[PDB]
Amino acid sequence: ASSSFKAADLQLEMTQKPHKKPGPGEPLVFGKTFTDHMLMVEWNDKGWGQPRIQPFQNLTLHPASSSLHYSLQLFEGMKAFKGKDQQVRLFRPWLNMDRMLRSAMRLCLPSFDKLELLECIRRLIEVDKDWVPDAAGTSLYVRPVLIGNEPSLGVSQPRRALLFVILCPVGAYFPGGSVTPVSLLADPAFIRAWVGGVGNYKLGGNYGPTVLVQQEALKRGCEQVLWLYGPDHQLTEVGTMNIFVYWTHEDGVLELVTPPLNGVILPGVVRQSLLDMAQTWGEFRVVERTITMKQLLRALEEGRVREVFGSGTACQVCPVHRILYKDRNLHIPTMENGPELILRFQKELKEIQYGIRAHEWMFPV
Amino acid sequence: ASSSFKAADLQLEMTQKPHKKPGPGEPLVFGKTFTDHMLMVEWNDKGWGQPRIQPFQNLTLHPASSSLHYSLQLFEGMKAFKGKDQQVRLFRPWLNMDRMLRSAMRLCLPSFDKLELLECIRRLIEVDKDWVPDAAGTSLYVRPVLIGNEPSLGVSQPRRALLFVILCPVGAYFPGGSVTPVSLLADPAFIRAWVGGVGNYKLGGNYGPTVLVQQEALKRGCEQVLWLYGPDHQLTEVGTMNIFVYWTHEDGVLELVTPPLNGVILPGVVRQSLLDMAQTWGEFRVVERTITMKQLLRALEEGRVREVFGSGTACQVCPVHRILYKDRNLHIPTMENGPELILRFQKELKEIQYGIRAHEWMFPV
Ligand SMILES: *Cc1c(COP(=O)(O)O)cnc(C)c1O
Numbered sequence: 001a002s003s004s005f006k007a008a009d010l011q012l013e014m015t016q017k018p019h020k021k022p023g024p025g026e027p028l029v030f031g032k033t034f035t036d037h038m039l040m041v042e043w044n045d046k047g048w049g050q051p052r053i054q055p056f057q058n059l060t061l062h063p064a065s066s067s068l069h070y071s072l073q074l075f076e077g078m079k080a081f082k083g084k085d086q087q088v089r090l091f092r093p094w095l096n097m098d099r100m101l102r103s104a105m106r107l108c109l110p111s112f113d114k115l116e117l118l119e120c121i122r123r124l125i126e127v128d129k130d131w132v133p134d135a136a137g138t139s140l141y142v143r144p145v146l147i148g149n150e151p152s153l154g155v156s157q158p159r160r161a162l163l164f165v166i167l168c169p170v171g172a173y174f175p176g177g178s179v180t181p182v183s184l185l186a187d188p189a190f191i192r193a194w195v196g197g198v199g200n201y202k203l204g205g206n207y208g209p210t211v212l213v214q215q216e217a218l219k220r221g222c223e224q225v226l227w228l229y230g231p232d233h234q235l236t237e238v239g240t241m242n243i244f245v246y247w248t249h250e251d252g253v254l255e256l257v258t259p260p261l262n263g264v265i266l267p268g269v270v271r272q273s274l275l276d277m278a279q280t281w282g283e284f285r286v287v288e289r290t291i292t293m294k295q296l297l298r299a300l301e302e303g304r305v306r307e308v309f310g311s312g313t314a315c316q317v318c319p320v321h322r323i324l325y326k327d328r329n330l331h332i333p334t335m336e337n338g339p340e341l342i343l344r345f346q347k348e349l350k351e352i353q354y355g356i357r358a359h360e361w362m363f364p365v
Numbered sequence: 366a367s368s369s370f371k372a373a374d375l376q377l378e379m380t381q382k383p384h385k386k387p388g389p390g391e392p393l394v395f396g397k398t399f400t401d402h403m404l405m406v407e408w409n410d411k412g413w414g415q416p417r418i419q420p421f422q423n424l425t426l427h428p429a430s431s432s433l434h435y436s437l438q439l440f441e442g443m444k445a446f447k448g449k450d451q452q453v454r455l456f457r458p459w460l461n462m463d464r465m466l467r468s469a470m471r472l473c474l475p476s477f478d479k480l481e482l483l484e485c486i487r488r489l490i491e492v493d494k495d496w497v498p499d500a501a502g503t504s505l506y507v508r509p510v511l512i513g514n515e516p517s518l519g520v521s522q523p524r525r526a527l528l529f530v531i532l533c534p535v536g537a538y539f540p541g542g543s544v545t546p547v548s549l550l551a552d553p554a555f556i557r558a559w560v561g562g563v564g565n566y567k568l569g570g571n572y573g574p575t576v577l578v579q580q581e582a583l584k585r586g587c588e589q590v591l592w593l594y595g596p597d598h599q600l601t602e603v604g605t606m607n608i609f610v611y612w613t614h615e616d617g618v619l620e621l622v623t624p625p626l627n628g629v630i631l632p633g634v635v636r637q638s639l640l641d642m643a644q645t646w647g648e649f650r651v652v653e654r655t656i657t658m659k660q661l662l663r664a665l666e667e668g669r670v671r672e673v674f675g676s677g678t679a680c681q682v683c684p685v686h687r688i689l690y691k692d693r694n695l696h697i698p699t700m701e702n703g704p705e706l707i708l709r710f711q712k713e714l715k716e717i718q719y720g721i722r723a724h725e726w727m728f729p730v
């Protein structure tokens with residue numbers, strides 16, 4: 001096949017049926033509202049077809065499409081922010097393209113040029129730029145997707161695939177102005193991923209099984225799930241966010257710790273940014289190490305825990321105030337210790353993402 | 366328990382240009398050929414819509430459909446056999462409806478009436494009766510599917526879903542009652558499922574990750590993957606088939622063992638039928654117990670292993686002759702021991718499935 005698709009061959013098809021732009025009491029609910037256009041690229045045995053920006057529209061799929069029978073599907077999630085200047089910028093897009101390609105290979109889906117995809121994405125955002133909000137805390141969510149599309153019930157490498165990208169204006173989850181903490185359910189019975197599995201890839205298959213578990217967290221009074229793994233009940237992730245703990249460890253050294261990338265953790269872009277940032281300050285120890293409930297419990301009643309939070313594109317730095325472990329509620333002093341670290345992290349990202357401070361992390365328009 | 370969707374409400378729209386059935390003597394690649402009609406039922410806040418048999422046609426899905434982003438998809442697989450009298454019968458369909466409903470609940474998808482679905486399926490196959498082959502070893506593969514279909518990027522219980530069924534005429538795994546054995550790759554690095562996971566449900570998410578692993582088996586010279594689990598390397602399944610071992614156990618008694626239905630085993634319909642059948646004979650011990658490579662190695666060098674095989678709808682009883690474990694090829698004496706048990710199982714099933722012997726296991730037309 002010919003290399004992979006190119007931004008120079010983009011075909012533009014403008015919408016004739018514009019969508020009404022969010023205008024109510026400004027109620028932006030994540031993943032519900034879509035912009036006017038979308039990216040679409042098809043892959044055959046002839047290889048990749050020409051990239052196309054077209055009006056948002058339904059997909060037409062053969063009933064035996066492997067994307068629907070054997071979960072040959074993966075996705076990404078990243079944000080575009082509009083600064084006061086009106087300039088739109090994407091936050092570390094390159095990392096998302098890297099991760100997306102890794103996912104593609106894991107599922108035997110067609111490789112592509114990451115810089116070519118980023119360009120097409122840039123062109124798509126340009127076309128729908130008017131959908132990018134600028135109110136404090138708002139942004140545009142970009143959702144690239146790659147699916148196998150073989151008209152065959154055989155479980156095998158697809159010879160046809162489909163890559164598309166859709167956009168959603170978002171208004172930052174819920175609290176709006178403040179930063180309210182969440183409570184978590186920690187029950188060892190629920191398993192999200194395993195060593196040797198595919199938890200470290202953003203594949204649709206990893207999420208479907210969590211819907212029921214999340215419902216159990218609600219019916220139990222919690223807002224999200226703290227995923228535990230292993231006999232030692234290590235803390236892997238929170239909902240769909242990586243987890244960080246800021247405390248003074250056993251050796252009495254103050255540190256920021258987050259589980260290591262050993263197969264069951266999704267390598268979050270925000271996660272990597274927080275480590276990079278904290279490592280740059282050089283004010284305290286920053287490490288990737290397994291974290292156990294045992295260590296947490298001991299640390300809690302020894303008054304060593306300062307802040308616990310999740311990190312992810314949807315909720316950059318999310319405070320945790322309660323963890324329901326063994327029928328036992330554990331209060332997490334995050335807010336008591338002014339979320340000092342959380343607050344500094346949030347300030348820094350805000351400055352970087354909205355262009356207040358120039359940074360290599362931001363990708364123009 | 367919430368029920369709905371009835372068969373006496375079937376809307377019916379006959380094809381308009383019937384495709385021509387496959388060619389006698391000309392092979393059919395399993396799952397590549399589809400019949401003229403399909404079943405389609407939609408679900409939303411208004412509950413289940415009317416069932417419909419319609420011309421095979423592509424699906425139209427919203428780009429944010431949860432079936433494509435978070436793998437809210439599940440499927441089933443069962444066969445219809447046409448006897449000599451041109452009579453068509455489904456093999457233990459009820460078990461597939463039971464399993465399908467279990468899968469539905471695990472993914473928070475809409476519950477439905479198992480008998481109502483079976484009727485709609487009977488009607489669909491009835492309409493496509495002609496597509497059911499009648500040469501030895503041939504049959505019709507039925508592929509029911511239920512997918513979430515929420516136009517939202519939120520990971521949550523869909524408020525819309527789609528249930529459909531498509532049919533494929535299948536050849537016969539063995540060219541001419543061949544019954545040739547397969548070689549397997551047994552590498553502990555792979556891992557298909559985990560205790561506490563969803564390996565015991567037929568969810569699309571369980572299969573996507575195996576494509577790459579299967580390719581590695583081919584490159585290593587094997588035909589299928591022997592899935593190992595745990596520190597003790599227990600044998601869980603082969604490819605997409607349950608595994609059975611017929612041998613002289615360590616206690617001196619002759620037995621037919623297959624792994625226990627803990628969370629890492631898919632409860633196969635053929636698997637249950639083989640256990641039922643062998644228990645009915647009352648000729649030897651039949652047990653569900655864990656099987657380790659360690660046990661396999663000893664029994665093997667002690668000449669205690671008689672036959673090893675996989676079981677599944679696609680390949681009812683599949684002989685295994687070689688297992689590539691630690692870089693070391695293990696010969697499995699299955700064919701040497703006159704393929705006794707396997708041949709007896711294939712014959713009994715053949716008699717039951719093609720109506721040679723009346724049996725409660727068969728469901729008419
Ligand atoms: C998306 C996701 C994350 C966070 O990744 P970001 O790239 O920082 O958005 C963490 N864990 C899971 C399970 C995720 O799906």
Ligand SMILES: *Cc1c(COP(=O)(O)O)cnc(C)c1O
Nearest residue numbers: 605606607631633634635677678
């Ligand atoms: C389909 C399947 C089986 C066999 O089930 P049958 O109901 O006997 O067809 C076994 N294991 C896996 C992983 C399967 O997908």
